[PDB]
């Protein structure tokens, strides 16, 4: 039961800046037997396993290169990326093995990059789910920075709340932008009520909504 | 090559039980300590348990959260990893990973790939598939399954680049999902795109061309 402490949660910076991230724990990871601190480090990417780049607070896993370094004794240790690279992104958390092993909260690396537009797209129901009188209308916006972004549904000139549901990737390494999907769902009969269906999407990239339609009559 | 693996997961019942194996090749097994450890969704990583290696006496250690409750063992003929697990609450929702620890030789610690495990009284479902037709941007609509994981893939994955595939969100017991895909205007349609959907739970394989119009 030591408890350890990560910080902070997140942080956002340019391929090639240096950064620094820290643990704290309830108490000393340093063996008296061996003079080691029994603290380690490991990154864990998007959609993958976490693995280890760095045991006995400083030293590096065989493998790993020489950029990533780890720091300290005791209680506080800090791990360091000089030129962070964009495949870094993932969320780095501390682990103690000198009493049981505890892993720390985790510090999530976002990476910061260039200001881009989403490409917003958008998608009638398709004949086959109409079939079954469902009726999904969706919305993708792809590829942006900076992450927030905010979505809304117009439907024949009338703003619609509900029936959404909102999902967001996780950041691409390939070019560290986000993306967001946005889907609308109605029945079938409500669905063919209306004829004019508009995503806009507000970006720090624009004081103008980015706004994609279809009208009904023309399917 | 090392390999591990994690098998014996999935969907179950809350109060049941499970025993998650992990299948282990390319290394002396007996040498190593064995940890389990868990991720729910979205959260941190959390340390279960190891298992020590054969010159302690393969003796077994838990967090305080499972201890009691979960067990560890070895199959050391076959180089296999157990993790027993009794009474099971929504709190043990998660992926599952092996990892190997520490101990001998010369050169890493490795990790399994991970296994979901959902406690839910849902029932599994399979998915509705939908085309999502119009550099231009097809996708495909995955509606109304349970539980996670779904795979999809577009042209038995011979297209990758341009791939985006949102996270599931569930409501009332069913997991929608949505998968974009990016082309040049000018392949399609004239060369065919085809949305592949894998939801192992219900043994569903789809294919779902995007037919333009």
């Known amino acids: 039961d030591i408890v350890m402490t990560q910080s902070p949660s997140s942080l956002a910076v340019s391929a090639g800046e240096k950064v620094t991230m820290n643990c704290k724990s309830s108490?000393?990871?340093?063996?008296?037997?061996?003079?080691?601190?029994?603290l380690a480090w490991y990154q864990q990417k998007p959609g993958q396993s976490p693995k280890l780049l760095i045991y006995?607070?400083?030293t590096r896993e065989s493998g790993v290169p020489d950029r990533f370094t780890g720091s300290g004794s005791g209680t506080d240790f800090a791990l360091t990326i000089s030129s962070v690279q964009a495949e870094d992104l993932a969320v780095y958390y501390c682990?103690?093995?000198?009493?049981?092993?505890?892993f720390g909260g985790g510090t999530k690396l976002e990476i910061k990059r260039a200001d881009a537009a989403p490409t917003v797209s958008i998608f009638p129901p398709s004949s086959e789910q109409l079939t079954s009188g469902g009726a999904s209308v969706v919305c993708f916006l792809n590829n942006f920075y900076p992450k927030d972004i905010n979505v809304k549904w117009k439907i024949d000139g009338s703003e619609r709340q509900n029936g959404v549901l909102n999902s967001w990737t996780d950041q691409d390494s390939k070019d560290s932008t986000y993306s967001m999907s946005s889907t609308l769902t109605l029945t079938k009969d409500e669905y063919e009520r209306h004829n004019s269906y508009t995503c806009e999407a507000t970006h720090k990239t624009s004081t103008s909504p980015i706004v994609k339609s279809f009208n009904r009559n023309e399917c | 090559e090392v390999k591990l693996v994690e098998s014996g997961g999935g969907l179950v019942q809350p109060g049941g039980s499970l025993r998650l194996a992990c299948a282990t090749s390319?290394?002396?097994?007996?040498?190593?300590?064995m940890s389990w450890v868990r991720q729910p969704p979205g959260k941190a990583l959390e340390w279960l348990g190891f298992?020590?290696?054969?010159?302690?006496?393969?003796?077994?250690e838990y967090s305080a959260s499972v201890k009691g409750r979960f067990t560890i063992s070895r199959d050391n003929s076959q180089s296999s990893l157990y993790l027993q697990m009794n009474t099971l609450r929504a709190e043990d929702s998660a992926t599952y990973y092996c990892?190997?620890?520490?101990?001998?030789?010369?050169?890493?610690?490795?990790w399994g790939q991970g296994t979901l495990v959902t406690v839910s009284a849902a029932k599994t479902t399979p998915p509705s598939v939908y085309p999502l037709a119009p550099m231009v941007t097809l996708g495909c609509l995955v509606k109304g399954y349970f539980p996670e994981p779904v795979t999809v893939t577009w042209n038995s994955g011979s297209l990758s680049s341009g791939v985006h595939t949102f996270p599931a969100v569930l409501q009332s017991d069913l997991y929608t999902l949505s998968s974009s895909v990016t082309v040049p205007s000018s392949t399609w349609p004239s060369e065919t795109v085809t949305c592949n959907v894998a939801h192992p739970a219900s043994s569903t394989k789809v294919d779902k061309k995007i037919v333009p119009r």
């Open positions: 682990k103690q093995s000198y009493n049981l092993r505890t």
């Open positions: 006995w607070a400083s």
């Open positions: 390319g290394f002396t097994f007996t040498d190593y300590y």
């Open positions: 298992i020590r290696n054969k010159a302690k006496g393969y003796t077994t």
């Open positions: 108490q000393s990871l340093l063996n008296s037997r061996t003079r080691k601190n029994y």
């Open positions: 990892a190997r620890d520490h101990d001998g030789y010369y050169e890493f610690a490795y």
